[PDB]
Amino acid sequence: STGSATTTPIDSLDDAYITPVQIGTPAQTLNLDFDTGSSDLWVFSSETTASEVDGQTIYTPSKSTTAKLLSGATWSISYGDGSSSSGDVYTDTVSVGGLTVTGQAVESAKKVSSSFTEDSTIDGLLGLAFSTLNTVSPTQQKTFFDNAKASLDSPVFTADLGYHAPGTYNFGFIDTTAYTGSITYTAVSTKQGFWEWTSTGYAVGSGTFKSTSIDGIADTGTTLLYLPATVVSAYWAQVSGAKSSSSVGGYVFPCSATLPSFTFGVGSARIVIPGDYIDFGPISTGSSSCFGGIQSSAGIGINIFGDVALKAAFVVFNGATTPTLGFASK
């Protein structure tokens, strides 16, 4: 089997992407944030504290003939941005772009933190990291991809995120029309539950490539590119007036600037992030200070190849017995 779904930016900055997901019978369609940095499929629901729901579409298990309470199971998660959610668990039928999993754990939120409430466009998350990170207790549950894997034509999914435009998540096949050149594959460590890999280096604009190992995670659920402070400083030093602002919480730059590109290495190959992808616009409405799309990972504890990086590539998440990651230009 295969599936293919379009993923759409939630706003004009590409702060996140939402993908329609069918849950239950008859289908209830919710727009979920596909997150290769976590492993819980959780949704706003009829059980969510009413004061914490503000415009989201909810899953109502009592209206699904295929929903079954997973008795005794609870979940609770905290994300790297400090947001969190928790609740209980149902199993139900879940379909993405024509690909159907029966008995999928659908984690129903009883509580969500303010960041989720305030974002009307995201109805929940669909985790695509390794199932070892799943938070369901006392019986850990499998991700949608893990459940689908054995049925898929090939045990893979691909992320093809757009810049200021829709893109595509495919399951079970590699669309050879979706990228240019060849796909370069690179080794993955699953020890921390993430799609963790090692970039071979970087360049800033038309500058020379610096060969240096940068361990990090491929994370569709993180907006920006978080790299070591040395790398980030080298980038922003090429932008007149750019500085790290403690008050704002990262690098800012004059909105009048033209940003250089940023290249990262995948083996002997190179992915180029155009300068425009690194612009996240005014820090507040009407400001002439703009927020940068490359920020320091210092204090996160891990480097994160988030959407800024991933949207410059066609990315293969290969869930074969020995997982790997593939990157192509597009």
Side-chain angles (χ1 to χ4, degrees), residues 1-62 64-67 69-109 112-141 143-148 150-190 192-242 244-330:
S1 60
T2 63
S4 180
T6 297
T7 193
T8 301
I10 65 165
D11 63 25
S12 65
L13 298 178
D14 298 346
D15 281 319
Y17 299 77
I18 49 173
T19 308
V21 177
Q22 282 70 49
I23 310 175
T25 309
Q28 297 181 38
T29 299
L30 274 65
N31 295 329
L32 306 188
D33 185 351
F34 282 25
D35 180 14
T36 64
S38 69
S39 306
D40 286 52
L41 193 176
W42 76 259
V43 296
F44 276 79
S45 72
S46 57
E47 303 183 325
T48 309
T49 299
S51 67
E52 294 179 352
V53 182
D54 187 9
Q56 296 80 11
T57 294
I58 62 168
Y59 168 60
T60 302
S62 66
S64 174
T65 59
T66 41
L69 180 72
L70 187 61
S71 185
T74 57
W75 61 280
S76 180
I77 192 164
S78 306
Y79 298 99
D81 66 353
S83 70
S84 64
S85 49
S86 63
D88 53 18
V89 187
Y90 292 83
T91 58
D92 208 340
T93 302
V94 171
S95 300
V96 176
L99 168 67
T100 302
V101 168
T102 58
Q104 173 65 44
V106 176
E107 301 173 34
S108 170
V112 305
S113 67
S114 59
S115 175
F116 287 114
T117 301
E118 293 162 358
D119 189 354
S120 64
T121 69
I122 292 175
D123 301 324
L125 268 62
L126 190 150
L128 293 168
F130 294 90
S131 294
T132 53
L133 294 178
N134 176 267
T135 77
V136 179
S137 178
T139 309
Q140 184 171 66
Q141 300 295 302
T143 69
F144 175 81
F145 177 56
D146 206 347
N147 281 324
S151 304
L152 291 181
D153 290 358
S154 184
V156 303
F157 69 91
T158 65
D160 180 9
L161 304 177
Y163 167 67
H164 293 353
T168 305
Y169 280 102
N170 291 330
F171 291 83
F173 73 103
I174 290 158
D175 178 0
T176 60
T177 71
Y179 59 85
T180 62
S182 60
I183 308 176
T184 299
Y185 289 86
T186 195
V188 164
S189 171
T190 62
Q192 297 175 1
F194 299 120
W195 294 91
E196 188 166 13
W197 65 289
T198 303
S199 172
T200 49
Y202 72 100
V204 175
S206 58
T208 57
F209 186 85
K210 176 71 171 184
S211 294
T212 185
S213 293
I214 306 175
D215 295 346
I217 66 166
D219 187 0
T220 57
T222 291
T223 312
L224 306 184
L225 172 54
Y226 295 88
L227 292 173
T230 46
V231 179
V232 176
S233 183
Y235 178 80
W236 290 108
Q238 298 304 311
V239 180
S240 181
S244 183
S245 167
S246 171
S247 58
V248 176
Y251 281 89
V252 295
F253 67 96
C255 293
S256 59
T258 298
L259 296 177
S261 63
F262 184 88
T263 303
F264 64 94
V266 183
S268 58
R270 308 288 181 251
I271 299 296
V272 181
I273 306 172
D276 289 341
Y277 290 26
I278 298 161
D279 177 19
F280 280 75
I283 59 171
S284 297
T285 303
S287 179
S288 75
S289 181
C290 275
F291 198 66
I294 295 176
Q295 297 291 347
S296 179
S297 63
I300 298 179
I302 198 147
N303 300 305
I304 306 173
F305 293 87
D307 297 335
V308 163
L310 301 181
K311 75 179 85 169
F314 177 86
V315 189
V316 182
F317 292 80
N318 170 27
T321 309
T322 298
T324 64
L325 274 172
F327 292 83
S329 298
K330 64 188 184 189

